[PDB]
Amino acid sequence: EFKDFPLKPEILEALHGRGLTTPTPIEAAALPLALEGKDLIGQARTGTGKTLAFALPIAERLAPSQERGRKPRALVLTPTRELALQVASELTAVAPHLKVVAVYGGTGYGKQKEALLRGADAVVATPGRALDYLRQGVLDLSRVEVAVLDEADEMLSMGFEEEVEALLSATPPSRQTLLFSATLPSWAKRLAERYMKNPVLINVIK
Amino acid sequence: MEFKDFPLKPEILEALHGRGLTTPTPIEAAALPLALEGKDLIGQARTGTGKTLAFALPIAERLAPSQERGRKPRALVLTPTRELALQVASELTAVAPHLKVVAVYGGTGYGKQKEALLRGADAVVATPGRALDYLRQGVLDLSRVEVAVLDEADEMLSMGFEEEVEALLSATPPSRQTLLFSATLPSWAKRLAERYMKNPVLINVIK
Ligand SMILES: Nc1ncnc2c1[nH]c(=O)n2[C@@H]1O[C@H](COP(=O)(O)OP(=O)(O)O)[C@@H](O)[C@H]1O
Ligand SMILES: Nc1ncnc2c1[nH]c(=O)n2[C@@H]1O[C@H](COP(=O)(O)OP(=O)(O)O)[C@@H](O)[C@H]1O
Ligand SMILES: Nc1ncnc2c1[nH]c(=O)n2[C@@H]1O[C@H](COP(=O)(O)OP(=O)(O)O)[C@@H](O)[C@H]1O
Ligand SMILES: Nc1ncnc2c1[nH]c(=O)n2[C@@H]1O[C@H](COP(=O)(O)OP(=O)(O)O)[C@@H](O)[C@H]1O
Q1: Torsion angle of C-alpha atoms A204, A206, B3, B5, degrees rounded to 10
Q2: Assigned fold of A1-206
Q3: Could you count the other beta carbons within 10 Å of the beta carbon of residue B90?
Q4: Residues in domain Helicase ATP-binding (chain B) (predicted)?
Q5: Interface of B with A in 187-206 (CB under 8 A)
Q6: Which of A29, A192, A199 is facing B201, going by the closest CB pair?
Q7: Out of A36, A166, B6, B194, which residue is the most buried by the measure of CB atoms under 10 Å away?
Q8: CATH 3.40.50.720 fits B1-207, yes or no
Q9: Domain ranges of chain B
């Protein structure tokens, strides 16, 4: 159960307050290495649940800050707007001490910009809108300590390979990288080769 | 992580420290948490590198001592070679002082190994050929195995023990925990994982 893991009381409170008590098989498998700062690839069948495998480690690794205009120390990339909002919602709830900002197309071009300018600790973004702000200097990725690629195989199918690589290339290689994907197409193995540091593959095979 | 960082009995931690075993290799670090909690796993790392503690410490921690004379082993480790059976037995013996480990291997001493098995054992570390000999004789009884380990599955397939391994695993109850270590997963080994393991997690540190 989550209380078993070594997580700050605020985080356990947040989880407890929300009913989340038992990690899914992929979460239980991935949490230990992720919490310890190591790079990993988490692979499991879609529809089981794995968001806590990267959100808890972001919650735990990052001390809070109130510095206006601060750059984000965590970046989560998702292939769709609806997943960016679901993930930003989860992360916001388990990291109550962090300012989480969702970046995604179709709306809020001005509002999301303003949010990022005021300050952010973690960004959950679709690659389109994110790359826009990257090019404008609005999204600054130079302080990223944890980068997460959520559903790498979908980002490939949606044709975001170029945006994803540009975004990762803008983060410091001192970062921890986590990659989650039901399948591992050649593109994702390459991302692994090029952007990760001796990653452990963790695969719930059946 | 160091070994001290894991939830292990004090006697086991003392054993480790006294031998200057402090630092799990990458596969040990990645696999210990699942193994300790009793889950099935496949550990993949390049052949021969250190991984013995990834299954030795789970066996040491899981099994309580017993005095019963003639008792059947609660853990089985299979290895492709005699030299690997011997290495692993000594290692397991070292970190599981509360258990009686018996090494079972060909090329020598049919009677000595047999008599050791009849006196009783908690863990057997075996090569598949010799082990099947004893299984069929009724000397090696696998009906109480809680942890079964295949150490270097891809080499067992290479050495021609495909059938012997399947026969040994079949003689153990499905309620067991099963740990499979191999640098590569040929078709036979995947088939093994599919049909002999329960919801296994594959852990691959080859990178
Ligand atoms: N351990 C857990 N327990 C309960 N809910 C969880 C959970 N982990 C987790 O992510 N969730 C919830 O599951 C939701 C996503 O579920 P999906 O779309 O079926 O995940 P998929 O298997 O990746 O395709 C998240 O927003 C979490 O709130
Ligand atoms: N359910 C869905 N089905 C199809 N396309 C979708 C989708 N959800 C979703 O977000 N998309 C598309 O995936 C992309 C989301 O990334 P972005 O950063 O918002 O891209 P930008 O529009 O260039 O700023 C958009 O094309 C979405 O319409
Ligand atoms: N955590 C650990 N620390 C020290 N020794 C260990 C160990 N785990 C483990 O199995 N051993 C021993 O290390 C031996 C394998 O080490 P090698 O041949 O030098 O290859 P390399 O690991 O690539 O450097 C095993 O036979 C064990 O007895
Ligand atoms: N370094 C090595 N090189 C080649 N063969 C080896 C070997 N080490 C080793 O053990 N073998 C062979 O691997 C087999 C070990 O299994 P068994 O249970 O002893 O099988 P049995 O023949 O029924 O007694 C034997 O053939 C060993 O000679």
Answers
A1: 50
A2: Rossmann fold (3.40.50)
A3: 13
A4: 32-203
A5: 193-194, 199-206
A6: A29
A7: B6
A8: no
A9: 1-207
